[PDB]
Each structure stands twice: as C-alpha cells, then as structure tokens.
Amino acid sequence: GTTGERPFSDIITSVRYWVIHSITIPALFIAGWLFVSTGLAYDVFGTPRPDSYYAQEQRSIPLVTDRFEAKQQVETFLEQLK
Amino acid sequence: AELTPEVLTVPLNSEGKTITLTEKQYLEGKRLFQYACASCHVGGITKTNPSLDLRTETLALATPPRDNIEGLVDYMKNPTTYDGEQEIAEVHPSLRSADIFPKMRNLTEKDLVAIAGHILVEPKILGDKWGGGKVYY
Amino acid sequence: METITYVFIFACIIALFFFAIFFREPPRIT
Amino acid sequence: VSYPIFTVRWVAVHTLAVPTIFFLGAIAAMQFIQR
Amino acid sequence: DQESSGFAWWAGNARLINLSGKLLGAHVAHAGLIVFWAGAMTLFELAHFIPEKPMYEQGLILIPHIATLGWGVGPGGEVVDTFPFFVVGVVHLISSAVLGFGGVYHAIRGPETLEEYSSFFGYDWKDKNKMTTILGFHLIVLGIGALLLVAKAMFFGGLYDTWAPGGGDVRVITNPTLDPRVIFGYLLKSPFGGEGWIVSVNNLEDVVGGHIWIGLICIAGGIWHILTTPFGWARRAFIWSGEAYLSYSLGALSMMGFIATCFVWFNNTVYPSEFYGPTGPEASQAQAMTFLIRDQKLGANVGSAQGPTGLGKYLMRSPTGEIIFGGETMRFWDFRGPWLEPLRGPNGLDLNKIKNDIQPWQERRAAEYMTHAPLGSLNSVGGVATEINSVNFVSPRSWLATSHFVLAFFFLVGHLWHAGRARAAAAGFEKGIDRESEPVLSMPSLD
Amino acid sequence: GWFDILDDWLKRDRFVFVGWSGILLFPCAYLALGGWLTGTTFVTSWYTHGLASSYLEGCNFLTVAVSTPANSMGHSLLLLWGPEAQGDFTRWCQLGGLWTFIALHGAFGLIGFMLRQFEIARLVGVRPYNAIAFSAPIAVFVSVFLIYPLGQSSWFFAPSFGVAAIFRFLLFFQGFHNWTLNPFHMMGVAGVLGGALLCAIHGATVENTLFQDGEGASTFRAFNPTQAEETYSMVTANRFWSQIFGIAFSNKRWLHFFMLFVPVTGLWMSAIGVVGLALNLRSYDFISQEIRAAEDPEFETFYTKNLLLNEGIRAWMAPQDQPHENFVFPEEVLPRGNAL
Amino acid sequence: SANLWERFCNWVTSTDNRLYVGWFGVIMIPTLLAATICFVIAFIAAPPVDIDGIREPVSGSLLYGNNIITGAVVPSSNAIGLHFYPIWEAASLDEWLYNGGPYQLIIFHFLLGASCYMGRQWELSYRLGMRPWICVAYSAPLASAFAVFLIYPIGQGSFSDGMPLGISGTFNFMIVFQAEHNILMHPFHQLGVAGVFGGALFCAMHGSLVTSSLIRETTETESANYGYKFGQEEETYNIVAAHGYFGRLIFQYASFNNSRSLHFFLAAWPVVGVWFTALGISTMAFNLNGFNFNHSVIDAKGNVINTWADIINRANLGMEVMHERNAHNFPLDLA
Ligand code: CLA
Ligand code: CLA
Ligand code: CLA
Ligand SMILES: C=Cc1c(C)c2cc3nc(c4c5[nH]c(cc6nc(cc1[nH]2)C(C)=C6CC)c(C)c5C(=O)[C@@H]4C(=O)OC)[C@@H](CCC(=O)OC/C=C(\C)CCC[C@H](C)CCC[C@H](C)CCCC(C)C)[C@@H]3C
Ligand SMILES: CCCCCCCCCCCCCCCC(=O)O[C@H](COC(=O)CCCCCCCCCCCC)CO[C@@H]1O[C@@H](CO)[C@H](O)[C@H](O)[C@@H]1O
Ligand SMILES: CC1=C(/C=C/C(C)=C/C=C/C(C)=C/C=C/C=C(C)/C=C/C=C(C)/C=C/C2=C(C)CCCC2(C)C)C(C)(C)CCC1
Ligand SMILES: CC1=C(/C=C/C(C)=C/C=C/C(C)=C/C=C/C=C(C)/C=C/C=C(C)/C=C/C2=C(C)CCCC2(C)C)C(C)(C)CCC1
Ligand SMILES: CCCCCCCCCCCCO[C@@H]1O[C@H](CO)[C@@H](O[C@H]2O[C@H](CO)[C@@H](O)[C@H](O)[C@H]2O)[C@H](O)[C@H]1O
Ligand SMILES: [Fe+2]
Structure with missing residues (x-):
C-alpha cells in the first residue's frame, strides 16, 4: 500500500552512503574498543577488574547488607581491597 | 596481581627448603595436570578411589610424606600405597610404567616438577574446594 | 470413594466423546 | 523523487545502530582481556 | 533457469x-x-x-x-x-x-x-x-x-x-x-x-x-x-x-x-x-569392576556383600539366573568385552576367578574406561x-x-x-x- | 487548537507509526531494551548477589544478566536520586538500580505498546482483538516481575533478565513452590502448549488444502493479495479432520476466535497461579498422601519421589542462592542418597 | 460377487466412511485399542511396580493410593532393561505386573498406532485429492513421543528410564533429566521453547488479527460467528485491513499480506522448533548434554567467580543427589 519516504535498497547502494559511513562505523567501533581498552568502562560501571573481587584473602563476598547506608558500605568494600 | 610469587611458594624438600615456582610453570603445571591427571583427579579428588585425595594435609599424613615437591615427584616416578607398603607403579601411571601409561612417556623431570608444584598451589588458591567435591562445587 | 469420583468424570468425558462425534449437528453446505 | 535526507525514521534507525556498533566494538575488545 | x-x-x-x-x-x-x-x-x-x-x-x-x-x-x-x-x-x-x-x-x-x-x-x-x-x-x-x-x-x-x-x-x-x-x-x-x-x-x-x-x-x-x-x-x-x-x-x-x-x-x-x-554399557560395567576389585583388594568378600536394598553391592543375579555385576549396572548385564570375559564362567561372572584371577591389565583397563564414559x-x-x-x-x-x-x-x-x-x-x-x-x-x- | 496541529503530526502515516501512545511507548521501550543491553555487557552483579553477570566480566550470552538488587534493599524503587543511590550513577549500578529501571520502564513500555494497538486500531478502523489479546502477556509480566516480588521480602527474588538467570528462577520454583504441581500452571501449559498445536495444525491444514490458482509449484504467488474467493477449501478441510479425528472445524470465524482464547486464557491462569505464590500460597502437597506415607513407610508414589528432589534442590542451592542469609550447612546435614 | 477381497479393499478405502479406516488404520485401530484399553485399566487398578532395579515397588494406580495427579503407569523394571518383556514371557501376570509389564505393552502399542496415525493422515488426503504434508507437521509431536518413550531408553539402556505414563511422573522425568543433562542449557530445548512459546504467540496473533477484521454481517444482538456460512463462497474477513493495521503496528514490510505465505510461517515455526526438542531428547539420549559453564569466569588469583550458570548447577546437584536414593552403589552415575 502507501509507500512513503527515502528507500533503503537505494540508500544502501548509494556511493554517498559508504563515503559517509566508511568513517562513521569503524569510528564507533574503535571508539567503543577504547572504552573497554582504556579501562574506562570498568570505572564507569563499578565493575571489578579480574584482580579486584577479594583482597588477597577475604574468601568472603562483599555483599551490600542494608539500604540507606548502602553506598558508604560499598565504598569501604573497595577500600579494604587495598 | 593476585597470584603473587608468595602464593607460589611451596615446600621443596622435607627438611624445610621452599621453591617459588613462576607463573609460567604454574600454567604449564596445570596443562600437564589436565593432560595426565584430571581424567581421574579432577578438582583434586579420585574417581577410582574416593577415599584418598590430593588435599595437602592428606599428602602430609602419607608415607613417605608427599606434601612437598620431592615427595610428589618420587610418586610420579614410582608410586606406592598410602602406607608405602606396596609399590603400585603397575596400576597407577608413572615413569616406572610408561610402557603402559603412554601419556607418561612425554613427561620429563621438569614437567614432573610443575605437575607436582600445581598439586601444592591449587589448594592455596581454591582452599576447601580442592579437597572435596559436589559438596563444594 | 475418590477412585469412583475420578473414574466417573472420566467415563463422562468418554461418553461425551461419542456424542460429540456421532451425534453432532452435521455441517451442511449453505 | 526528492526524498529528504533526515527523517524521523533516520532518528530511530540510528538510536539502535550507533549504540550497537559502539558495543560490538567494546565487546570485541574484551575477547583479549585476560588474567 | x-x-x-x-x-x-x-x-x-x-x-x-x-x-x-x-x-x-x-x-x-x-x-x-x-x-x-x-x-x-x-x-x-x-x-x-x-x-x-x-x-x-x-x-x-x-x-x-x-x-x-x-x-x-x-x-x-x-x-x-x-x-x-x-x-x-x-x-x-x-x-x-x-x-x-x-x-x-x-x-x-x-x-x-x-x-x-x-x-x-x-x-x-x-x-x-x-x-x-x-x-x-x-x-x-x-x-x-x-x-x-x-x-x-x-x-x-x-x-x-x-x-x-x-x-x-x-x-x-x-x-x-x-x-x-x-x-x-x-x-x-x-x-x-x-x-x-x-x-x-x-x-x-x-x-x-x-x-x-x-x-x-x-x-x-x-x-x-x-x-x-x-x-x-x-x-x-x-x-x-x-x-x-x-x-x-x-x-x-x-x-x-x-x-x-x-x-x-x-x-x-x-x-x-x-x-x-568405551561402549556406554562398557563404562557402567567397569565402575563395578573397579570397585569390586578395590574393595576385595581391601578385605571385602564380594560374593556375600549385601547392599542398601538387599541385592548385594558387587554381584547379583539376572532374570534368567546369570550372575552379573550389581548396581544400576544390572541393566547392562548384556555387555561382552575382552577385558571382562576371562572372569566369566558358565553361569556368569565366576567368583573364584574374580577372587584371584584378576590381572592388573584389567584393573587399569577397567579404570581407564570408567573414566572415559x-x-x-x-x-x-x-x-x-x-x-x-x-x-x-x-x-x-x-x-x-x-x-x-x-x-x-x-x-x-x-x-x-x-x-x-x-x-x-x-x-x-x-x-x-x-x-x-x-x-x-x-x-x-x-x- | 494546536493540539490538533500536533495530533495531525503524530498520526502521520510514516515508516514507523508514532501516535500519542508513542510519546510513551518509545521513551520507555528503548530506554529499557537499552538498559538491558548495557547491564548485560558492562555492569556487574557482585555487590548485589555474588556473581559475574556481564560480558566485561567474562560471561557469555547465556550466562549474562541484569541481576536483581540486594535483599537488604527491600522493595525500594531505587530511583537514581533516592536515599540509596544518593544520585551517584555508578553506585546506582552496583546496588542494582539497573533492575528496577528496566522493570519499571519496560512496564510502562508494555502499557504504551498496548495503547498503540488501541490507537492504530481506532484509526485503521478494525476491531481491537489484538490489544485485548495482548492483555495475556501484560498479566504474565505484571505478576511475575512485579506482583510476585512485592509479596515476598525484596526484589531480590524476581526473575533477573538473563537466559540462565531465568532457568534458575524455574528450578527455584520447582524446588520451593513445587510449581509443576499447581493446577494453574498446568492450565498455563495446556494453553501455551495447545496454542502451539493450533498455530501449527491450522497452518498445515490451510497449506495442504489450497485450490490451484497458479501453474507452478511454488503456490505462494497464486494468492491474490486482493479480495475474492477463499484460497484453500474450508469444505475439504472440515471433511479431512472429521473422518480422521472425528471432530473438525467449520466456521472460520469461530476457528480464529478459539485461536485467540486458547493461548490467551492459559497465560492468564498461569498468572493467577503466581499471584498465589507471592504469598507462598502454593500447591505444594496433598495431605492425604503425606499422612499415609508418614504412617506407612512402604507407600511410594511418583508424588513423594518428586518431593525429595525438592528437598535436595533447596538444601544444596539455598546457600549460594541466598547469600544475605549467611547459610552454613555442614556436610553432615546435606540430604543425599547413597553413594552419590 | 467380485471376490470379497476386491470389495474389502474398497470399504477399507471408502472415501465416505464416518471415520476413515485406511490401510494404515487397519493397524492403528487395533494397536491403539490395545494400548488405550490396557492403559485405562492399568491406571485404575494395578499393583506397585518395581521401577528402578532394586525392590522398592512404586504404586501408580488409583486403587492403590493415588489420585489423577499422582497416579501413573510405571515403567518396566530396570532388571529388565531393554529386554523385550511381553506377557508370555512372564511366569504369571503377577510377575508381569510387579515387573512393570504393562508399560511396554502400552508404549510399543501407542508408538505403533501413533505412527500409522501419521501415515493415515496422508492416505485420506490422497483419497481426497488434497495436498499431503499435514502428516509431516504431525511428525513433530510423534517425534517427541518417540524420543521420550523409545529413543531415550535405547540410549540409557532401559525402559525403566524414559517418561512414565502419568501426570506427576512426567514431572519426575523432567526434574531428573535436568540434573542429568542440564537440558535448559541445551540449544535444542531453547529452540523447543522458542517454538512452543513462539507458536502460541502467533496463534494469538493470527487468531487475533483475523477476528479483528471480520466483515460486519450481523446485528449487535447475535454472535459474530453467524456472519460465516459453512463452505461459503469467498473470504470472511478483510486480509488487507488486517495487514493494514499489523503493518502499521510495527512497520509495513515487517508484516504479512499473503495468506499462503502467512499460513505457512504458522505451520513451519512451531513444527521446526518442536522437531528440535525431539532432537534434543534424542541427542541427550546419547549423553551429549547441554552447555557447561561451571567454574568459568575465574578471577586473577584463581578464585572461581560463579555466574548464574553455577547457581543453576548448584540446584542441579541437589537433584542429582537425592534422585533414586537407594539405587546407587558407586561414585559415578553412568546409567
Ligand atoms: C553443492 C551442491 C549443489 C550443486 C552440485 C548444484 C548444482 C546445480 N544447480 Mg543448485 N542449488 C544449491 C546447491 C547445489 N546446486 C543450493 C543450496 C541452492 C539454494 C540457494 C541451489 C539453487 C539453485 C537454483 C536457484 C538453480 C540451481 C541450478 C543448478 C544447476 C546449474 C548450475 C548453474 O546454473 O550455475 C550457474 C553458474 C555460476 C554463476 C558459477 C558458479 C561457480 C562454479 C559452479 C563453482 C566452481 C567450483 C569451485 C570453486 C572450482 C573447482 C575447479 C577445479 C575442479 C579446477 C546445477 C545442476 C539452476 C538450474 O536448475 O538450472 C536449470 C538454478 O536455476 N540451483
Ligand atoms: C537425500 C537427498 C535429498 C535430495 C537429493 C533432495 C532433493 C530435493 N528436495 Mg528435499 N529434503 C531432504 C533431502 C533431499 N532432498 C530432507 C532430508 C528433507 C527434510 C528437511 C527435505 C526437505 C525438502 C523440502 C521442504 C523441499 C525439498 C525440495 C527438494 C527439491 C528441490 C531442491 C531445493 O529446493 O534446493 C534448495 C535448497 C536450499 C533452500 C538450501 C538448503 C537449506 C537447509 C534448510 C539448510 C541446512 C544446511 C545445514 C545442514 C545447516 C547450517 C548450520 C546451522 C547450525 C546454522 C529436490 C528434488 C523442495 C521441493 O520443491 O520439493 C519437491 C522443497 O520445498 N526438500
Ligand atoms: C540396491 C537395492 C535393490 C533395489 C533398489 C531393488 C529394487 C527392485 N527389485 Mg531387486 N534385488 C536386489 C537388490 C535391489 N533390488 C538383490 C541384491 C537381489 C538378489 C539377486 C534382487 C532380486 C530381485 C528379484 C528376484 C526381483 C526384484 C525386483 C525388484 C523391483 C520391485 C520389487 C520390490 O521392490 O518389492 C518390494 C517388496 C514387497 C512388496 C514385499 C514386502 C514384504 C516383505 C516380506 C517385508 C519386508 C520387511 C522388512 C524386512 C522390514 C523393514 C521394514 C521397514 C518399513 C521398517 C525393484 C525395482 C522384482 C522385479 O520386478 O524384477 C526385476 C523381482 O521379482 N529384485
Ligand atoms: C516467550 C516470550 C515472548 C516474547 C519474547 C514475546 C515478545 C513479543 N510479543 C509481542 C506481541 C504479542 N505477543 C502476543 C501474545 C503472546 N506472546 C507470548 C510470548 C512472548 N512474546 C505469548 C505466550 C503470548 C500468548 C499467545 C500478542 C497477542 C502480541 C502482540 O500483538 C505483539 C506483536 O506485535 O506481535 C508480534 C511483541 C511486543 C513488542 C513490544 O511490546 O514492544 C514494547 C516493549 C519494549 C520494546 C520493552 C521490552 C519490555 C520488557 C518488560 C523488558 C524486558 C527486558 C529486556 C529488554 C529483555 C529481557 C532479556 C531476556 C534474556 C530475559 C514482542 C516481540
Ligand atoms: C480423559 C482426558 C480428557 C482429554 C480431553 C481431550 C480434549 C481434546 C479435544 C479437542 C477439543 C476441541 C477443539 C476444537 C473445537 C471445535 O471446533 O469442535 C467442536 C466440537 O467440540 C467438542 O465438543 C469436541 C469433543 C472432543 C472430541 C474428542 C476426540 C476424540 C478422538 C477420537 C480419535 C478417533 C480415532 C464443534 O466444531 C465447531 O462447531 C461450530 C461452533 O459454533 C463451528 O462449525 C466451528 O467452526 C466448529 O466446526
Ligand atoms: C554446480 C554448482 C555448485 C557446486 C559445486 C561443487 C559441488 C564443487 C566442487 C568442487 C570440488 C569438489 C573441488 C575440489 C577441489 C580440490 C582441489 C583443488 C584439491 C587439491 C589438493 C592438493 C593440492 C593436495 C595436496 C596436499 C598434500 C599432499 C599435503 C600438503 C598440503 C596439500 C593440501 C597442498 C554451486 C553450489 C557452487 C552453485 C551452482 C552450481
Ligand atoms: C542504561 C541507561 C541509559 C541509556 C542507555 C542506552 C539507551 C543504551 C543502548 C544500548 C544499545 C541499543 C546497545 C546495543 C548493543 C547490541 C549488541 C551488542 C548487539 C549484538 C548482536 C549480535 C552479536 C547479533 C548476532 C546474531 C544473532 C542474534 C542471530 C542471527 C545471526 C547473528 C550472528 C548476526 C540512560 C543514560 C538513559 C540512564 C542510565 C541507564
Ligand atoms: C467408558 C468408561 C470406562 C470406565 C472403565 C472403568 C469401569 C469400572 C468403573 C467402576 C466404578 C467403581 O469403582 C470402585 O469405586 C469404589 C468407590 O466408589 C472403590 O472403593 C474405594 O473406596 C472404598 C470406601 O468407599 C474403600 O473401602 C476401597 O478400599 C477403595 O478402593 C473401588 O475400589 C473401585 O473399584
Ligand atoms: Fe487462518
């Protein structure tokens, strides 16, 4: 039925398209690759680096045990991590 | 930065010396352990004789003492019962029996050191896990 | 007393099967 | 025809396209994180 | 086209x-x-x-x-x-x-x-x-x-x-x-x-x-x-x-x-x-072989040994009477293999043989298989x-x-x-x- | 006055329709699928539970998830700016904020999408038996991801948005609620399972009853997308089945309504059931059986058998699955069969 | 006459017999009646059956302490295994019952008739000049009934294993299967679920949409159903108004408009998907189990970090351990 606006088949085939994207796509790919590569991701999402789960001993898991004072608790958890 | 060279220091002889195996040996020890051990000693137990395990305390009460490199090493060369009464090289893989346990043929004095050094470091990392199973998985 | 109650509802499904097949309203062409 | 270059659909097709590749790149980067 | x-x-x-x-x-x-x-x-x-x-x-x-x-x-x-x-x-x-x-x-x-x-x-x-x-x-x-x-x-x-x-x-x-x-x-x-x-x-x-x-x-x-x-x-x-x-x-x-x-x-x-x-049944068989041996070679009298249900840990009989290996393995009493036959007699697994004819090559072969099921x-x-x-x-x-x-x-x-x-x-x-x-x-x- | 100028804009037949409903459906929907995809690759479930839940940690597609918040959190909404997170986004990520975020956004997202079915239907002028049909899934998600937990201790016991993180939710249920023995889940199955049968027996009946309206073999083209005669023969079908199963349809209008009722109804019963397990008002046991087995030790039914499996599932699982409980079960306590 | 046989073959093949007995049906009919009749009796009255190998008889029938939900026909004994145990092979019915004889009789017969039932689902189509393949859609369920009742046992070595004919023992088959194969973690089951879950999803869609575009031909005070007449000439709803909406719900091309192409996708999705689960049970029948991610994600020192895959396994062990409490004498469950 009613077929409106710029078509994909064409756009994908358009030389202008790849001119534009054979910069943008890999750009994003390398942009994110560095997000992990730099170790930025870790710090953004408080996710532990392979060497940061338990300090040398503490075979005990750092489990948040109470809301309200939840954060302060997590902080000290990273603290202990020396 | 967790598997420190301190966690890699295990008793060398029975008198007291210690050896600080490298992270290179460790890995290779593990590779060699799965290569000729895991089949029957996965997780540090014993599929064909659950009574005896590879827990360090266990090896200590062995005879001769196996809670050190030289001891385990002797074993892989010529195994004996937990009391040392019988030589069991004919039913347990060893150098004295490579003709029957091929995998053993590759193995060299160097390899034997790693495999052994692995049997002593694991429990240092895994703790109770290394000894029992199921219950501890 | 339960056995009986279960076997009944069952005997009913089975008689209801007969009727639903051999005693439906024939689907006449219109 | 004289189709436009920036449409509502383009806004959509990109909100999922841009993040994805960003991720596929990040995720492809992890494959080398070890020990 | x-x-x-x-x-x-x-x-x-x-x-x-x-x-x-x-x-x-x-x-x-x-x-x-x-x-x-x-x-x-x-x-x-x-x-x-x-x-x-x-x-x-x-x-x-x-x-x-x-x-x-x-x-x-x-x-x-x-x-x-x-x-x-x-x-x-x-x-x-x-x-x-x-x-x-x-x-x-x-x-x-x-x-x-x-x-x-x-x-x-x-x-x-x-x-x-x-x-x-x-x-x-x-x-x-x-x-x-x-x-x-x-x-x-x-x-x-x-x-x-x-x-x-x-x-x-x-x-x-x-x-x-x-x-x-x-x-x-x-x-x-x-x-x-x-x-x-x-x-x-x-x-x-x-x-x-x-x-x-x-x-x-x-x-x-x-x-x-x-x-x-x-x-x-x-x-x-x-x-x-x-x-x-x-x-x-x-x-x-x-x-x-x-x-x-x-x-x-x-x-x-x-x-x-x-x-x-090893065959699937073969491996389930060898685990019994392995323990009938380990326990015997340890004091047990496998022929008389009675298990949790009353069937005998190591040996029990089949529906037609043959003496087979016990345990869930009772289902694989059909397995026939080189390493095991020498222990078989006319009425099934013979006791005397089992009691003192088990060469080491079997004890370890049996072990090999149970660990490679x-x-x-x-x-x-x-x-x-x-x-x-x-x-x-x-x-x-x-x-x-x-x-x-x-x-x-x-x-x-x-x-x-x-x-x-x-x-x-x-x-x-x-x-x-x-x-x-x-x-x-x-x-x-x-x- | 401009309301209309807007309404006009929104209701324009674009590639991807929008609508007033879209002013809700998209802000959320995306925002939810987005949070999942994020948490799935970047954030962890270490402070909340005690496991790696993302890619960056080492998990694969099957083992990743946006795992619920700590039990000590409660039924807290976990608003990024609330008492807990205290505005700090990263910590928010660590306490499990990403869960209530996905849950709640996805929630309004399903509300949005239904309004859509209701907006597009009103426009295009068709009956709304598709927004009605979609109530079935609202029930499931609204009772399994929202009601259930509200009935228990915290959010920690809701499914977790993960492939395995769900298989776990399955076993837990079998183990603590003995779900499979619930008449409501049973209906649930009878409906999903038979809704599949309808969706496949009908599909095959149509395809193997087609009149010839083409010359080649690939008869897909023979169907004029334009009106006219039925494309297969309802008369021939009705005949086939009636002689090969005794009963057979003969009212396309009824056939297609049944196809809506069956799978929809079953997911509804499925829901009511869980609304019950929120209060642990489960269908765990049959007392008549217990009393008998207590007195007579030789009475055994596949019923009792399964009950022991549960004892096992709870004993061995509980510990690592409910960390905030600091369970410690000495090896001598662990119920076990013989040997194994 | 004209030799009754000639005639017989015409009745057997009658295209207008209330129920189409066919050549396949000549077997389906007695086979299913033997099974169905033995099942119904077995389920009502029938002594406890020594399912596992031991001598711990389980009672499944009603007259022996069960209700419809707990009752079942118990699998032939483990002492029997894969051996063929018909009634004539018993020293007496009692032996036959105590050892689970009813099961074998019931499944071998149901599988035989259910197969011919598949064949019959072709013969009639032929006799009616219609296209075949309906019988191929039905090969999914059959394949699943075959897996669960015949393939799984041939692999494990005994009919004692292999789903028991009863509501609760079906749950048993599952809860245990999991612990033994970690099925939820096997591609083939996930495709089974996408199929069964998907199938339903689409059954609601198709049924939904169509109902949503029926052409007004009835008052407000009379069923919408009357608007259709059996065998009526043309279509009974606007397949274009249908697509007109669904297309706009997601987006035009992300929709159907070809009844034939739409209806095929309906019979292919669940069939292809359900086939797989049958191939999963049939596959895990030879011990190629689900994925295993236990003790992956290990940390820097060597500490195991546990992923959801482990909480899973933790609950699986609990199953592995308690199941068949008195049937094990050695460490490994290799049967
Ligand atoms: C591998 C198995 C296989 C084989 C042997 C064939 C064979 C054939 N196909 Mg089929 N086909 C297959 C799989 C296969 N097909 C699949 C999976 C599909 C679904 C996508 C199809 C779909 C299909 C269609 C839709 C059609 C055919 C047709 C044909 C026939 C004519 C070939 C042609 O037109 O080439 C065209 C020529 C080329 C563009 C060249 C292809 C490159 C060559 C053949 C490969 C070289 C191989 C190797 C790299 C080099 C070795 C060299 C060394 C020995 C020195 C031929 C009998 C046609 C037909 O029926 O004709 C009436 C036709 O219309 N096939
Ligand atoms: C024994 C060999 C065999 C042979 C020679 C044929 C031959 C033929 N088939 Mg049959 N078929 C077979 C087995 C065979 N089939 C089996 C076992 C099945 C059950 C699945 C089917 C199902 C089947 C169907 C449903 C249809 C045919 C059709 C046809 C005819 C056209 C071929 C075609 O459409 O190619 C084109 C092929 C393709 C589109 C590509 C193959 C695609 C499959 C699904 C991929 C499987 C690939 C691989 C295993 C998986 C990848 C890995 C995965 C993990 C991602 C041709 C006469 C067609 C016909 O017109 O019937 C008369 C038709 O509609 N066949
Ligand atoms: C490569 C395989 C092969 C193939 C494809 C054929 C094919 C054919 N043969 Mg040849 N044949 C072969 C090998 C083969 N033969 C060999 C090695 C010999 C020995 C020399 C013969 C000897 C032979 C003779 C003597 C005759 C044929 C005939 C025929 C033709 C029709 C007969 C028929 O199929 O009845 C199908 C069978 C039945 C209707 C009987 C069904 C009842 C039986 C008892 C039960 C079978 C059940 C089975 C054991 C169980 C599994 C079933 C399964 C569904 C679960 C047919 C073209 C006939 C012909 O026309 O001559 C040219 C004929 O008279 N053949
Ligand atoms: C098995 C799972 C299952 C899934 C995945 C599913 C999915 C879908 N069903 C839809 C529709 C339907 N489903 C229907 C009946 C059914 N659907 C069923 C089962 C499912 N239905 C069942 C059993 C039935 C009964 C037969 C009907 C009747 C319809 C429709 O009309 C509709 C459709 O258009 O059909 C194709 C689509 C609605 C899109 C949407 O709401 O966007 C808005 C919401 C968005 C984008 C946010 C996601 C919201 C949720 C709460 C968040 C989940 C969080 C993460 C994103 C993902 C989780 C990750 C996993 C690993 C656990 C969607 C593709
Ligand atoms: C002990 C365990 C119990 C197991 C229970 C099993 C239940 C499964 C039955 C299937 C449910 C019917 C769903 C379709 C509804 C329908 O459409 O069938 C209706 C008859 O319904 C009924 O009352 C069907 C009664 C059940 C018949 C059982 C079949 C037995 C198999 C024999 C094997 C032969 C070798 C009548 O047809 C309708 O009649 C009209 C409705 O206004 C319209 O014509 C419709 O289009 C349609 O034709
Ligand atoms: C028709 C067709 C088709 C098909 C095709 C085919 C089937 C093909 C094939 C092909 C083939 C089948 C090929 C083959 C080839 C081969 C070769 C080319 C070889 C070589 C070899 C060598 C060289 C050897 C040697 C060596 C040694 C001794 C050692 C060292 C190493 C080496 C390896 C070097 C298609 C689908 C596309 C399409 C349509 C059409
Ligand atoms: C959270 C959050 C947010 C946001 C965010 C977002 C919105 C995001 C997004 C994101 C995204 C949006 C992402 C994506 C990603 C993706 C990916 C990563 C993908 C992948 C894929 C793949 C890998 C595929 C594959 C395949 C399949 C599945 C099948 C078929 C075949 C193939 C192979 C192709 C905010 C700030 C508000 C706030 C806070 C929170
Ligand atoms: C097409 C229909 C097919 C039906 C096939 C079966 C036909 C036979 C139907 C028999 C119906 C009655 O079946 C009979 O019910 C009574 C209860 O009322 C059961 O009796 C049961 O309750 C009584 C007390 O009230 C107990 O003392 C008894 O121990 C218990 O088993 C019988 O054990 C059962 O055999
Ligand atoms: Fe339809």
Missing part, C-alpha cells in the same frame, strides 16, 4: 528434474564434496593426532575407521605408523579435484541433457527399465566395494581384532563365516535387549563372511536388473517418478541412519573401543552435567551416534515430504484442489 518459468529460487534444484546433463554435474560435483571432506578432514585429524594418547581423547572419527581396517596400529591399537593415514587422507583430497572438475564441467560447459549427446547415458524416469539398468550397474559397483573389504581382511594385512586371542591387534581373517544359518541368522534376531539384531556380530569371521555373502548377492542382483524389467505387481505398486525414486532412496538412507546410530553406540567389534571410547556437554566438557571444568572430552561414540540420529531422522521427515509429494504429483494435484472439480464436493456427506 528462472522462476516464472521453472519452480521457485529456494526450490532451485528441482528446476533440474529434467536436465540429466546438469543433474549429472550436480551429482558429480557433490560426490566430490564428500571425498574432499573425507580427505581434508583426515589430514586435519592427523595434523593434530598425537601418536600416543588415546584416539578417543583426541576427537578423531576418521582415523579410527582406517585403524580398524588394520592400518598403522599393531598390538592394542598402538598407532605404529602414521603414514597410512596421511596416505588415505590425501588420495581422497585429490580425487576430489577430479570429481570436482566433472561436476563444474557437466553442470556448466557440458550438455544440459544427455538426450542426443549419448543415448546410453541419457535416461527416462518413467522408463521403467533404463532405471533397472542404471540400478543394476551401481548394484554391481557396491558389490565390488564390499568384496574390497574381504580383500583387505583375507589378503592385505587383515583388520583390527579386539577379540584377538593374544589381545587386541591386527589379524588376518582366513576363515570367513560361510553358511547361511549363522550369517543370515543375525537378520531375524530381535533388536531388543540381550539378543541384539545386526548389532550383535562379535567376531570378524562373520563380518568378513557376511560381506563375502553380499557381493555374491548384490552383484547377482546388479545383473538380474540390467537384464530385466519390473514385473506386474512391481509396476502397479510403486510410483514411477524421478521425485518418487528419490523418496524410496531417502527412506532407505534414513532407516540405515538409525541402524548406524545403534551400531556405533553398542558394538565393540567393528568399533574397537581402543580407538573409539560417553558423557559430556556440547562445549566438550567430559563427565556428568554437574561436573566442573577441565578434562574436555566427548566420546566419538557420542558425537557419532548423536549426529547420525539427527541426520537419520530429518531424512525420514524428508522421505515423507517427497514420497507424499510425488505420490500426489502423479495423481496430479500437488498444486491445489481443482476449483471446478473438488472431489470432496462430489462425495456423500457423513454428518
């Missing part, structure tokens, strides 16, 4: 139902992918194969086949010489170029119809005879192939023999089982527990004799067909259509596909277990589902039996699909009910 003229793109290859020339190239080119594989993979195996480490512990499935024929093995399947492997692998890899050349050629350059290009090679589906002819040839070709095996056994090196009197080792069969009785017996032997079916066959004399007894039947047929045409019933029985011919041959494969999945999962003879892993995950992690990582391994016996049941099955589905289509394309209505004359519309209602 085109759709608006032939079939549909995803149905492409049916556009060739009537273009034998191309339909030959299709068949040739493909019959090249199989060889190519056989070849390319054997080298992939070999390139990884480690001379002295159990084959089953190395994901091999092709080399094991070559070994069983008696090629580069020696005593106990010792992998004495790798060359036969390299040798076999490549020959195929090359013969693939040949066949490959034919296909590409016959489906492109060559004539796309054997019609006039050669009236002997050309063929007619409904020609209820040129088919009986082509079949005939092939029926002879297979026969020559079967006889090749007998050759490799009775004349060139022999085959592997787990049952080898001295013990597993290559052995030249020189007493093929002749005689219909024994041979054909296996044919009408229940497929159920105990009396297996074809999957019994515990000795190479029969495997060999049985094959000798095949060409001298298979070729006997290859002739009878190049010399005749389907009788009356034959014609008023089957649908003579290209697609229909496929169907019958489809179900055929599928049916065998199961017969195979069963063979590699149960038989010990034509699948050494020294090259493949057919259990593992998709990502190849040997053992029970609850097991921890390390020791990645999956018995060839698993991989094989698993793959083939899938193939085997889908083919049965395939069979129906075509047998059902060709059986209606004939009456001619595989494209829809004829608006104008709906059979149903002329049948007395049931109400």
